[PDB]
Structure formats: structure tokens, C-alpha cells
Amino acid sequence: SQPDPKPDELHKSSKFTGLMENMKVLYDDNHVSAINVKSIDQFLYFDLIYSIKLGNYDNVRVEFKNKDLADKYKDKYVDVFGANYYYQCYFSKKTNRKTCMYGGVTEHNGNQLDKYRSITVRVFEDGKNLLSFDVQTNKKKVTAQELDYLTRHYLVKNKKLYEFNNSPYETGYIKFIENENSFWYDMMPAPGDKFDQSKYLMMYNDNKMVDSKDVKIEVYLTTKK
Amino acid sequence: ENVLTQSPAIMSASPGETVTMTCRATSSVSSTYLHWYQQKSGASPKLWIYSTSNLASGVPARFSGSGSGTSYSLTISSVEAEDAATYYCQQYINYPLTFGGGTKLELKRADAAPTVSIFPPSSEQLTSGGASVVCFLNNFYPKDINVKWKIDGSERQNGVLNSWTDQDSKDSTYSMSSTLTLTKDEYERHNSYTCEATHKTSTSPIVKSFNRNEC
Amino acid sequence: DVQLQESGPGLVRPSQSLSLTCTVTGYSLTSDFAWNWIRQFPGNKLEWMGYINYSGYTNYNPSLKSRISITRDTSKNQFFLQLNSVTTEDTATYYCAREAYYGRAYWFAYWGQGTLVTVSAAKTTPPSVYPLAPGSAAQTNSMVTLGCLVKGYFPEPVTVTWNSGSLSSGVHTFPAVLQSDLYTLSSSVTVPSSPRPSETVTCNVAHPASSTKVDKKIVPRDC
Numbered sequence: 001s002q003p004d005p006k007p008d009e010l011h012k013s014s015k016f017t018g019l020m021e022n023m024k025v026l027y028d029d030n031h032v033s034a035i036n037v038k039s040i041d042q043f044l045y046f047d048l049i050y051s052i053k054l055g056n057y058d059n060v061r062v063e064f065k066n067k068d069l070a071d072k073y074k075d076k077y078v079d080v081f082g083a084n085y086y087y088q089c090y091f092s093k094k095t096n097r098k099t100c101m102y103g104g105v106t107e108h109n110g111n112q113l114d115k116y117r118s119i120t121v122r123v124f125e126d127g128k129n130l131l132s133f134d135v136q137t138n139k140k141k142v143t144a145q146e147l148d149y150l151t152r153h154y155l156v157k158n159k160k161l162y163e164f165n166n167s168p169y170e171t172g173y174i175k176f177i178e179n180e181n182s183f184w185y186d187m188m189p190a191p192g193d194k195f196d197q198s199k200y201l202m203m204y205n206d207n208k209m210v211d212s213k214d215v216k217i218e219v220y221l222t223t224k225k
Numbered sequence: 226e227n228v229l230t231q232s233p234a235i236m237s238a239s240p241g242e243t244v245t246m247t248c249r250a251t252s253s254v255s256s257t258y259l260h261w262y263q264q265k266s267g268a269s270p271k272l273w274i275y276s277t278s279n280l281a282s283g284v285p286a287r288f289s290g291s292g293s294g295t296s297y298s299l300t301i302s303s304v305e306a307e308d309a310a311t312y313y314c315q316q317y318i319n320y321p322l323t324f325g326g327g328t329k330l331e332l333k334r335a336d337a338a339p340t341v342s343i344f345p346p347s348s349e350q351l352t353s354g355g356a357s358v359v360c361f362l363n364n365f366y367p368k369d370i371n372v373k374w375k376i377d378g379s380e381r382q383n384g385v386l387n388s389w390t391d392q393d394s395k396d397s398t399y400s401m402s403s404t405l406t407l408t409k410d411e412y413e414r415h416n417s418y419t420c421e422a423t424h425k426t427s428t429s430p431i432v433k434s435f436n437r438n439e440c
Numbered sequence: 441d442v443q444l445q446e447s448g449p450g451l452v453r454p455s456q457s458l459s460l461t462c463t464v465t466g467y468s469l470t471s472d473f474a475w476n477w478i479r480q481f482p483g484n485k486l487e488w489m490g491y492i493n494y495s496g497y498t499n500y501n502p503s504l505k506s507r508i509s510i511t512r513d514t515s516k517n518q519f520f521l522q523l524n525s526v527t528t529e530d531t532a533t534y535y536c537a538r539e540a541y542y543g544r545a546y547w548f549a550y551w552g553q554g555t556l557v558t559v560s561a562a563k564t565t566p567p568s569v570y571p572l573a574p575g576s577a578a579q580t581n582s583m584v585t586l587g588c589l590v591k592g593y594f595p596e597p598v599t600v601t602w603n604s605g606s607l608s609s610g611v612h613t614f615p616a617v618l619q620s621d622l623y624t625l626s627s628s629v630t631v632p633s634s635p636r637p638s639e640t641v642t643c644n645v646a647h648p649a650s651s652t653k654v655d656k657k658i659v660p661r662d663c
Binding site: 226257258260262268269270271272275276311313315317318320321322323324326327340342343344345347349350353355357359361363386387388389390393400401402404406435438439440 | 483484485486487488499501502503535542543544545546547548549551552553554568570571572573574575576577585587589591612613614615616617619624626628630661663
Binding site for chain 1: 317318319322
């Protein structure tokens with residue numbers, strides 16, 4: 001298990017003097033969804049490129065924490081599911097528009113359901129069971145990235161989580177609990193005058209997985225005094 | 226793919242001199258993924274610096290590495306003779322993983338004129354046909370020497386094979402060897418044979434008589 | 441500690457394959473790191489071939505993906521390389537290396553001795569070995585120069601020493617050179633006049649391809 005965030009102070013949506021659209025748009029409707037595909041190229045050793053087909057791209061570059069992963073997954077029919085940016089995203093092809101991502105790859109064959117587990121989410125503004133709801137995958141081991149995107153693409157779309165200017169909420173995180181192992185992510189931007197999408201999303205780059213069932217979700221919030 | 230480019234190929238140095246080689250990448254790496262390997266001749270390479278600046282196990286801190294973007298350097302402060310070698314930068318990240326084409330490092334010394342000899346075809350080769358005359362030009366700084374072949378005096382020649390040794394180890398020096406191969410369908414009927422070299426170390430070309438005077 | 445052992449047939453014929461082995465020691469092939477084949481050509485340029493990784497996973501230099509196989513026997517703990525449709529532009533020294541890493545930083549820590557591979561259509565040939573004494577220049581200085589010729593073999597390598605390699609002192613071996621499909625190679629030694637023809641001198645050539653042990657005493661020529 002990874003220890004809670006009080007010795008790991010969070011970010012504050014106000015001590016970010018950038019803009020909040022640079023965040024809400026990563027957890028807005030658009031994303032990289034794809035089923036059963038094999039990397040067709042590789043630019044950097046920790047990368048794979050997928051040709052797959054809304055509006056500004058088509059070839060996806062997936063980035064991992066390791067030189068491995070790229071291996072493993074290079075040439076496997078997989079699913080790809082994560083956030084994705086274009087701003088700070090270049091890469092060459094060898095296959096005589098471009099989007100980028102991190103992690104988000106699970107193996108397709110032998111991971112499907114019928115049958116589509118719903119994971120419940122408990123939201124805690126201030127510290128109070130102030131909302132809930134479920135998200136739904138259709139697969140055995142799911143990427144936390146994938147999970148987190150969902151939980152987010154709800155909150156935003158109903159409880160203003162992300163605005164453009166700053167945030168309603170001071171801090172906020174998303175905890176993931178399996179049986180003997182829990183862990184969290186910080187929903188809040190890097191402190192300063194402007195915010196790095198690639199830096200941020202680079203948290204996933206490890207490709208962390210849960211398991212459709214054994215997993216609950218807890219989203220903790222606070223407000224700006 | 227991302228070719229890596231080394232300047233210069235070779236570089237002489239006197240022991241104590243401090244020097245620098247370069248590594249120009251296309252594309253452009255971060256300093257972390259930029260390594261140098263050292264290879265002494267007849268041997269595998271070996272890591273020297275990784276992540277550009279970082280020395281490996283038991284390399285004297287005469288060695289250092291600066292570089293960034295697409296320009297990287299390898300520096301040796303006081304340069305001992307045990308430093309003679311070829312050096313290869315190497316980028317990761319890119320796929321394919323790349324090496325630059327060596328910078329060879331040779332030591333400077335005080336000139337030395339050669340130390341030449343010349344030989345007979347030996348009974349064997351003689352009995353087996355062919356007759357081959359050999360010339361040995363040993364230990365002579367700098368790299369450069371000029372071997373010219375004479376028979377019955379004034380006469381060119383085809384049928385000759387040179388091969389230079391790499392800068393020798395103690396003797397920071399050089400040797401070469403030229404070979405005149407030919408047939409008993411000849412050797413027998415000429416008598417006078419010489420090779421003759423021309424180093425800066427002398428004004429008169431160096432010579433070596435030989436007319437039937439050995440088996 | 442982690443050593444790396446190459447091996448293979450010293451010579452392949454144009455178009456055959458080229459299976460090579462790396463035998464690992466001191467470290468298990470399956471605990472970590474990649475395991476790479478790198479070959480270096482004449483003129484020294486180093487080309488990466490590709491690695492079988494820590495979990496049996498590959499990645500190849502795309503300049504060859506198609507003719508390239510890197511496989512492993514975890515139970516003899518060694519890895520291998522297969523090379524198709526070899527052409528002479530494949531003559532080279534082959535190293536196998538395992539890596540080390542800090543962060544996103546991967547490099548090659550350990551390397552194998554190497555392993556020459558001539559790619560050629562030439563009659564394997566046993567060398568002709570000759571003795572070389574001077575006319576009689578034991579007249580000039582303290583040391584005199586005598587040598588050993590080894591004309592006409594193939595392929596490389598041959599290996600030589602003097603007095604069964606009991607004298608390096610003042611030897612000088614030369615790269616051989618290529619006589620239309622055969623190699624000829626010279627070597628020098630120089631010892632004081634006094635030693636010789638008293639103290640004994642004897643060259644010992646070796647061409648493994650044609651399984652040729654051969655020693656040669658340079659008995660001096662009185663004429």
C-alpha cells in the first residue's frame with residue numbers, strides 16, 4: 001500500500017496561476033479509445049506508435065516508464081485507452097496528424113467480459129459522502145489511467161471540477177483501493193503561471209493496472225477558503 | 226537512423242597534453258542517454274562515460290564529458306600513453322540505438338628513424354616454386370615512411386604487399402612490413418635486390434644490399 | 441561475476457545462415473536487462489543488431505528486422521543470433537553485451553571477447569610456413585633481426601608466437617594481407633647478436649581452420 005496524502009501535501013487550484021482548460025480538456029469528452037491493435041512503429045525506445053481511426057489527429061504515440069513495456073506490447077493486439085495531448089508532441093514515423101500518450105495499453109485477447117463490471121465511486125467534498133456513481137469497463141484487468149479518466153469525465157461534466165480559469169476545489173485526489181493495496185493520484189495542476197500536459201499525464205506512463213472487480217474508488221475534495 | 230558523428234578520426238598527443246574529441250548528433254539527445262566507450266585494439270569495447278559526464282568503474286578522473294543537444298565532447302586532461310585507444314559515443318533513445326565512428330587516440334613521441342632488414346626466399350619456398358623477399362621497417366615515429374623497391378638497381382616493381390602495425394605500446398612507435406612475392410621462374414636470374422625506405426628522420430633514403438649472399 | 445562468451449563457425453558461405461551463441465555466466469539470463477548482439481566491421485564502425493530482453497522479448501535494428509533472429513535457451517542459460525542470406529558485407533566481429541540502467545538511462549556494461557565471422561566462398565586453406573634468417577648481418581649492432589613468413593592460408597585467424605610464446609620481449613606481428621583469397625602474414629623479433637645462434641629461436645604458427653600445429657626453427661644460413 002501507498003500512504004495517504006498528508007505527508008504528501010497536495011496542489012492547490014489557486015496557487016496555480018495558469019489556466020484550467022489546459023486540464024479540463026484532458027478529461028473532457030475526447031480521448032484515445034481503440035480496440036485490438038498492434039503497434040505499427042516505434043520512435044523512441046520507451047515508445048510505440050499506433051495508426052488508428054475526432055478533429056485534429058490520427059496516429060497515436062504511446063509512452064512507457066520503461067524500455068520494456070514497449071517490448072512486451074510492441075506487436076501484441078491490445079487495447080489503448082488514455083488521455084492525450086498535441087501541444088508538446090512530436091515524433092518521426094518510419095512508415096514511408098500526431099497525438100501522444102502514456103501507458104493505457106492492455107492486452108485485448110483474453111481480457112474481455114460479457115457482462116461489463118461497474119465500479120462505484122464515492123466522492124467526498126470537505127470530507128462528506130456528498131456524491132457517488134459508477135463507471136463501467138468491459139475487461140478483466142483495467143488501466144488505472146482508464147479508470148481515472150472516467151471518474152473525471154463525470155465530475156467535470158456535472159460538478160464543474162474543471163473550469164478554464166481555476167478550480168472550485170482547493171485540492172482533490174483520486175484513491176484506488178484493491179484488497180491489500182491502495183494508491184492515489186493528485187487531481188491538481190503544477191503550481192505556477194502555466195501547466196505542462198505531458199509532465200502531468202506522465203504519471204500514467206507506468207501503465208498501472210487494477211482488476212475490474214476487486215476495486216473501489218474514493219475521490220476526496222476540499223474547497224478554497 | 227540518427228547517425229552520430231565524430232571529429233577527428235585520429236589525434237596525436239604528447240603525454241601530459243590535454244585534449245578533446247567531439248560527437249555531433251543529428252536529431253539531438255538529452256545528456257543522459259549519451260555514452261562513450263573505450264576500445265584498446267584487439268579487444269571488446271568498454272563503457273567509459275554514461276549520461277555524458279559520468280565516469281564508469283576505475284577510469285581516472287583525467288576523463289570528463291560535456292555535451293548537450295546535438296553537440297557532445299569527451300575530454301582527457303593529462304594524457305598518459307595508457308590512453309591510446311578508439312572512442313565511440315553512442316546514443317540510446319532513438320531506435321535504432323547508434324554508435325559514432327571512433328576517434329583514435331595515438332601518442333606523440335620523439336622521431337626515431339626505422340631499423341630495417343631484408344631477407345632471402347628460404348630453401349622451402351625456393352623448392353616449392355615462388356620466391357618472396359621481405360623487408361622489415363621497425364619502430365619509427367612519426368606514422369609515415371616510404372618503401373621503394375629496386376632489383377638490379379634502377380627498377381620499379383609490382384608484386385609487393387605492405388602492412389603496418391598499430392602504434393606499438395612501450396615504444397610509442399610504429400613498424401611496417403613490405404613483401405615482394407615472385408617466382409623462381411625469375412629470382413634465380415637477377416642477383417641484386419634491395420628495398421629502400423624514406424623517413425623524415427634521414428636525408429639519405431635508407432637502403433639494404435643483397436645479391437645472392439644468402440640461402 | 442558476469443562474463444560473456446561468443447562462439448560460432450569462423451566462416452560462412454554466401455547465403456547460408458549464421459547461428460551464434462552467447463553463453464552467460466555469473467548472471468541469470470532472466471533476472472534483468474537486455475542482451476544484445478552488436479557487430480563491428482572492418483573500419484571499426486559499430487552496428488547494433490538487436491536484443492532479446494530480460495523476459496524473452498525482442499527488438500531489432502530495422503535495417504535487418506527481416507533477416508534477424510535473437511532467441512534464448514534459459515535452461516543452458518545462453519542466447520543466440522541467426523542471420524539470413526548473409527552476404528560478404530556481413531563479415532564482422534560480433535559482440536554480445538548485457539546492459540545496465542539508471543532511470544531512462546540504458547548503456548552496455550559487459551562485453552564478450554568478440555568473434556570474427558568471414559562470409560566467403562573460398563577454399564579453406566592450410567598455411568605455408570617459412571623461416572627467415574638474414575644474409576649475415578650479424579656484424580652491425582648488438583641485436584639482430586630475424587622473422588617468420590606464413591604465406592597462403594584462409595580464413596583468418598592464424599595465431600603465432602616465438603619459442604612457444606616464451607619470448608614477446610621484442611616481437612612484431614603484422615596484420616596479414618589478402619592474396620586473391622589467401623592470407624600471407626609476417627612477424628618480427630629482434631634479440632642481441634650474442635643470443636643466437638646460441639640461445640634457441642623457434643616460431644610456432646597456428647591455423648585452427650585447417651587444424652595446423654606447426655613449429656619452425658630459424659637455423660642460420662652459413663651459405
